[PDB]
Amino acid sequence: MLLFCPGCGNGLIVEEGQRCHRFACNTCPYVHNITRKVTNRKYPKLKEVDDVLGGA
Amino acid sequence: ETLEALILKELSVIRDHAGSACLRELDKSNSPLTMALCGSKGSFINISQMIACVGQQAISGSRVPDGFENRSLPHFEKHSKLPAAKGFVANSFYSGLTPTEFFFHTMAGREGLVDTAVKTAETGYMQRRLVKSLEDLCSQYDLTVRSST
Amino acid sequence: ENEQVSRSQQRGLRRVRDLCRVLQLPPTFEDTAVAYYQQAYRHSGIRAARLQKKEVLVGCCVLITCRQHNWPLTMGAICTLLYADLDVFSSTYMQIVKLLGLDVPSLCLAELVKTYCSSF
Amino acid sequence: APIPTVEEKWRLLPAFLKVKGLVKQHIDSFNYFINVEIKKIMKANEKVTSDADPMWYLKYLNIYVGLPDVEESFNVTRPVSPHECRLRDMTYSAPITVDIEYTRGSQRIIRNALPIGRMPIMLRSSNCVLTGKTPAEFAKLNECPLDPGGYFIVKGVEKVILIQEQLSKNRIIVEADRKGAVGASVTSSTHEKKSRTNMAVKQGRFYLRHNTLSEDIPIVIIFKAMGVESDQEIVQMIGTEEHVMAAFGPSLEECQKAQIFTQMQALKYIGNKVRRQRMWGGGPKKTKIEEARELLASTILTHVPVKEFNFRAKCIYTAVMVRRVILAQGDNKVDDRDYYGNKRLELAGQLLSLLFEDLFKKFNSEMKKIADQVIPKQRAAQFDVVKHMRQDQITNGMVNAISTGNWSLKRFKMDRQGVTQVLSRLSYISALGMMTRISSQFEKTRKVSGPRSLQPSQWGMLCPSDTPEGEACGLVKNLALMTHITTDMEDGPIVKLASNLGVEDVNLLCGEELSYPNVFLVFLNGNILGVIRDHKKLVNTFRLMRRAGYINEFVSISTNLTDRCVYISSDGGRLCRPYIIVKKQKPAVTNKHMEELAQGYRNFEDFLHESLVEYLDVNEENDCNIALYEHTINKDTTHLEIEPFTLLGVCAGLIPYPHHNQSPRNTYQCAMGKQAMGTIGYNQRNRIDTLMYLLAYPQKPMVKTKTIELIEFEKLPAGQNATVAVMSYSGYDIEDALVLNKASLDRGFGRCLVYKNAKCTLKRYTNQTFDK
Amino acid sequence: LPKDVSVAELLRELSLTKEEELLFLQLPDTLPGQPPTQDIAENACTLADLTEGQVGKLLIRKSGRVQLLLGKVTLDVTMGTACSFLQELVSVGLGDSRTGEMTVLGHVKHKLVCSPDFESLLDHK
Amino acid sequence: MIIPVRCFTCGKIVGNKWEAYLGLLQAEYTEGDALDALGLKRYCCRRMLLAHVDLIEKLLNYAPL
Amino acid sequence: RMTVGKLIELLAGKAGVLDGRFHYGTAFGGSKVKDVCEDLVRHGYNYLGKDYVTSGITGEPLEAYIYFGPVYYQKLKHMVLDKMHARARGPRAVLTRQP
Amino acid sequence: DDPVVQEIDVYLAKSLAEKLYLFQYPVRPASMTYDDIPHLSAKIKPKQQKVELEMAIDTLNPNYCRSKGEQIALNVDGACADETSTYSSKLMDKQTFCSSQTTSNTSRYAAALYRQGELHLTPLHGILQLRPSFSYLDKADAKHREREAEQARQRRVQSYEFLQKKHAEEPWVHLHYYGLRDSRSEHERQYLLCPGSSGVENTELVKSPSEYLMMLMPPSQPSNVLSMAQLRTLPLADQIKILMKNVKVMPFANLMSLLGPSIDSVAVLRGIQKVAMLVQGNWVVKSDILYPKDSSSPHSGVPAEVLCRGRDFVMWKFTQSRWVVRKEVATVTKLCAEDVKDFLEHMAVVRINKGWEFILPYDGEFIKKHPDVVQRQHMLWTGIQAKLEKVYNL
Amino acid sequence: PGTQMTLKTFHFAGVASMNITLGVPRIKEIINASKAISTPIITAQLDKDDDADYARLVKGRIEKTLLGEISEYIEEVFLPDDCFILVKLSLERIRLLRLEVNAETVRYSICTSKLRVKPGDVAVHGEAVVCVTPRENSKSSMYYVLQFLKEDLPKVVVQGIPEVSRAVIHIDEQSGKEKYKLLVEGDNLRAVMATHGVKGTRTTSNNTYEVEKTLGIEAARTTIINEIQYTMVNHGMSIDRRHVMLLS
Ligand SMILES: [Zn+2]
Ligand SMILES: [Zn+2]
């Protein structure tokens, strides 16, 4: 999900560091090591209906 | 869409039953009935519209769309899918129409007029191009259709 | 023709045009004035003259124009729109009417009164 | 228990027609023009100063239009009746006087009454000699008392300015493209500029497109240049719903692809993408650091104002635009151009104001050019403006623009055609119907068949069944019997009352607040006033104030729950229609009020002031519920319709029992009545037109609509009552044919007279010779 | 999370909690008074032109209605937009010409809106 | 303009009866009873008298004279 | 064309000219059919306008009742006297020698 | 719905009226506070209020990428120049927050310190929005770029450069920041109250609700023409004339309701006799009022003097009897039927088999109340009757 | 007949759906021989026309299905050691539509025109779980291109002819016997004919150019005749077959 830097308000991005992967800011040294799993479910809408035809 | 189809079927069967009642009730030697029976001018649909009930006024094969926000006209409530609220005419031509019914009937009439107005020019262009293309073909005496060459 | 119109003759005819325009005259008066100007500009001594001469010539041309089609207009009202003095205007008018000899009807007193009385 | 009915409710209609109605739109617009707009235009260009030789100036002080006059007498003027102008083929106009001051030789000299042209005078206007006159005076002036007026007379022909219908400016329009991609567009139009900007989603990311820009720019770059730099602000400011961030993510990725993180960088990028559309310079200006800033400040979203390079309000406006685009990209709720909530009407006043302003600007520019040419060089012959006030400029411009019907105003780049039409004098009803005609902005741009349709929004303002059958079917409309057109307003007290009513200033809040469901935006003619909660309280208070008279009654307020916005419309050209107010299932009108109106104790304006009858606009009537009859009134009926038969127009009024007919027959009858054979006016004998038709023995209809009595059609009938027998006879009446009685024709039935004019001119040429 | 109303807000912050709280409110443009010898034309009579002491009375009516009697007139008080970001009320004490005391006073949690009850004014006359 | 001399359908002289008709409407008389007094049994004559508009006087008001 | 309005107008006009009134055909209102029927029957005519009619040619009564009534006819500008046109050899154009 | 709970006293304070600013960070949620970040500097321009904060950002914390910090500090300044270095160390020492102005005026906004049951208000000097500045990146870009490398009437007011110069003139005012943990903050906090008695009547805020509505909403300032609201502003005598002109027949009792009960009977009875003449206990407007001498008949053009005689004769007739014969009036007055009809329509209604009847009932009640006026009108009628008899030869 | 045709509607053609451009514009297309047409209709016969299960099976065989339409949920998973994208297939919906799709099928469908993702990138742990781990392609490719993959990973095709948009079953309402035809709004007749369980001998189309390029010029002529006659009858007006045969 779109994470923003508390230090300066810019959009944090994902990158890989030395101990683990970190969220990083492109303008200021604020980084946050990903200490454990983080998920972002989307739950896209499925193809529910089938719609056979030929009725009156 | 299922609700719309059900309502359309119900209103159509209402109109058809009213027309059948009209035709059964009418006496012979009735001028519109005679003119519709021999097919000279008009049909039983016109007689039913003038006597029994004008059917649902359909635009592009559907009920009147919501010109305002969720309402066909201000005189009906929001998200109202009642027969009259979406275009049906309960009255007959003899009894006269209410302002909403008259407005919807004029809607249908203007739709028809616009369709005719565009179709005339479309067919004119079609005809001229086709006759330019297919003019030279003729059947020779050997019964074989041959081109200009 | 219409290309041998030097800067001076163009300025002169444009002056005639704007002068007959500010007076609110019909287009026939403008046509007659420009025709009379083009006719007077055929003399060598006329074209070779100072700005004052051309201006007073325009004034006299518009005067003659409005004079023919029985429109009274005092010279004062014309000089009031020209950047010149009336003393040289009169002399140049006499000089040109002595050279051109065009028809000069007399100023009608009835129309002059009709024009001047309404100004009150 | 049937609800008691005020049977004399229709009495409201004549009283309304006393103040406004058929022709009063044109007359009011023209009078407002010649009394306010001309002075405002003079104020706009009060001073002109030559670049060369400064300290010279020309100051306009006041302007007047005088009375309609003729200059046939030698330098003398004289009052002229309009019929005389008709006969001699002249423009019925009035001189335009002005008072000025100027320094010919560094000395201030003023003029009091200096003509600058001649303004055509519309009949029955404030200055027209016909206004406020008795029928006997009309007879002495050879004019029909029943003549609607409202048309100019130029060179002896009667020309009418058709009311122009156009799209409302300064409104967000979201619509799909040819490829089906949903985009946005706004035509921000001001007197300074009329420019439209667009928003596309072509690659799943939003680009902003403008004519002045070489290539569309990602919107996040625009925000970064625009004053806001943290991406968090922009994301909060677009919307905090999950799908909103999902849609907006590609734009953020695109902006992060480039290294734009500073307002300077984005401004540089824009300046690179901004072309040198050099107008009349290209040297004193800076670069991709100043041009970009100015382009953001003025050209982009012109109507949104920046106080001093503070783009926060414009940021809010474009964020609202982006949110609208994103939300419309789901449920495909797309705006339809035929909904008259987004339409405006331009009468003679606005068009003439534009034309006069352009003519005045051009005349002043020409005067400045002449001065600059002659002031610095000639001699001590002190140049003065008086010697060059070329009168024919304004008069000729107006005459040509009115007569030819094509309007070229380069200052607004607008080139219209067929603005004016020759008033058809076939019949009195034809004259009235053409007087109440409305043209379309397209003039057949494309046969879309969408706008040609009769959309529901036209209810109660345009005649549904009255359209010109043919290529213009559905592209030309007529005003309904009972309708009114708004005029431009002051817009100040609306802002004052809004601010006092609890709307929070937009600058104070951050963009996240827009995402909350209960928060509502408020717009004033396309400008954001702010946000507020409890929109129903605001709407009720505003309407109650409007009823009390503290707010101009034509100012309308509407609510869009789908967009959670509140629109306060105050500009002129909106369609308005009166309505009877109903509270607690009872009308504000009582039979006692109708009795007073019959006795003359009160007029329509009194009803307006006492909160009994109020005007309604399309936008406001979109929210309120209306009833057609007392028995139809339910609990949720804010307003009651005054009279249903006002729905039809003037032409449809002639149709007896039109509800019993099929509508195409009504349309054919409207078109036929516009072509009827009958009397024209009480002065038809003196009139000399190109072509005239008179019925020998006209008779008033035996069955008449109330509209006939309203327009007094029976005073000038256009037909005969004949004893028809419905049957078949001799087979000579197969298809629409019909037989006549030879005796009836012999006895004068249907007898008609045709009048044609033959005119010749005898000129005197440049040579002192004449046609004889 | 629930969305509170003035009656609920003041009830919880007075009855359940005795701790003083910082509020921020937007008054109408002009107050129902006249600038006291402040060289005034019915000009902007704001909060600044008034004097110290008791200035108004706040009434929590039944059914959740909350009003502000400000003399003869009764304003209506409503929730402003619920700002979730940081709003800190600071004091800038310019003790010296080139020295100032930045004095944070407290966070701003709620925002109030005061508007005249125009309906009462109208049906009054 | 002016009252026609003959009824279109039947042809009865109706021109002369117009003037006295206005006299009848000059008094208290209504339309129908006035037509009965004039002697117009069939409805075509009643139509012609009733539906007529006397435009001739309005035009004469505009006459040179 | 389903123009019942014409029949209603004819009936109302017959009633009006019989009783010397001016019936109203105002949209969504006006005089109703019952009132004009009563006016017709009171004056001694059939209540639906249809009348017993004898043919002028044969002199024999018509089998079916005929519908008399006064109706408002308006003559139109389009007349045959102006629209009739015939063309002989006539003139030709200078560039292309055609009419 | 009484004020069931907490009738709350509201006070005004002015101790910090000029010292009070509201700072809000749109990017910072209320969850996190700057009470733990030690601030370094605060630069303010009192006029053209634009605050500028600089607060230290720690590096030894795990959330600092010191590798990135070294590079960014290298870019922003020189490698070893350091004469004007944004960060003293080789890292990014501090963070700078810039400000934006919300509104020109802050009078209508107030800070409410709500105590235990009592409320204190204080006007706001200004409101500023603080956002983290990115000017250091632009400085780095500038350093990189420099390392790699009687006139015509203008409008400098609308030029951003002149605006910057005008703002550049204001000298910066350095400030000492004091956090929430500072005792000075608490000491200055108590000044937000106001020392005053619990109950004192306010000398101000005395304006009436109607006066308040007026002052907050300030004004910008047929022959019937004028509406009733416009009518009531006119003098009483003019109101009687216009109202009586509108209706032309109007009972005396209704006039009292029309004008209003606040007007004395004698004054009304005084003006009405000037323009209205009594017929059958009812007031009828005089002919000359409806027909000014410069007016004429709209249908025949005869001068108003003729209309005055004709209308009065018809008006005088109604005094004699309730029924007037239309034909006899035309015979006597020699007027056209159109003009005669206009007179009768104004004050009479058609009656079948009886001619014309007076439109209003005989109001004897007004006659009984004021017999003096009834007698007065009678002599006036005799004078009018004498004029007509010699003219029309009755 | 172009004058006679009034552009009628509600002619659902026994299917209550599948809007088909008829009337004059249809003729305008047919004579124009446009390669791309609006609403291209392909009629297919089924060997086992009675079994609705078989009809659904072949419909899913031909109809193009996106990854997102079948995937029950997709999540970007960032871990201390690495980051990737996980997708769980809705085996419920899969067997409900009985598409021959599993973890291996989608794995093989992946590695096709998606930033040249390598077969080693994708792994199938469970039956419905599939994981993809990208790399730095350096062609303007930072690892945050994961988002880009999440943008278009649902937009990959797993089963069906790519040009086919929507296919619909259509029952035949003959009282004697009930048959199932298959309507396809696609642009590839050859692929439909090639698919299993389709009576390719009796399958027809609407695009004349497609019929010409697939079956020969004579089949194109027959299709032109049938299309013109069908559009002609749909408007009630009648033309002798000789005219349209000559035109074809
Ligand atoms: Zn950061
Ligand atoms: Zn007759």
Side-chain angles (χ1 to χ4, degrees), chain E residues 23 30 57 61 87 92 101, chain H residues 1 7 19 24 112 212:
Chain E
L23 286 184
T30 311
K57 293 176 70 67
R61 308 187 145 282
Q87 299 193 316
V92 179
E101 286 185 351
Chain H
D1 48 335
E7 182 179 2
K19 307 190 211 53
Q24 53 189 0
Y212 191 34

Side-chain angles (χ1 to χ4, degrees), chain D residues 723, chain F residues 6-14 40 42-49:
Chain D
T723 312
Chain F
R6 310 284 209 84
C7 175
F8 290 164
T9 70
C10 77
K12 184 195 299 292
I13 282 292
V14 65
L40 298 198
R42 69 188 41 89
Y43 62 79
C44 79
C45 301
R46 304 163 51 92
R47 160 186 61 92
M48 191 85 58
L49 267 189

Side-chain angles (χ1 to χ4, degrees), chain E residues 52-79:
Chain E
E52 285 207 7
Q54 183 184 7
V55 67
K57 293 176 70 67
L58 195 150
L59 303 187
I60 298 97
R61 308 187 145 282
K62 210 165 179 41
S63 72
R65 187 67 172 285
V66 176
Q67 303 209 349
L68 166 58
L69 262 66
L70 206 57
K72 310 185 171 35
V73 65
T74 81
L75 300 199
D76 194 73
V77 186
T78 48
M79 294 298 102

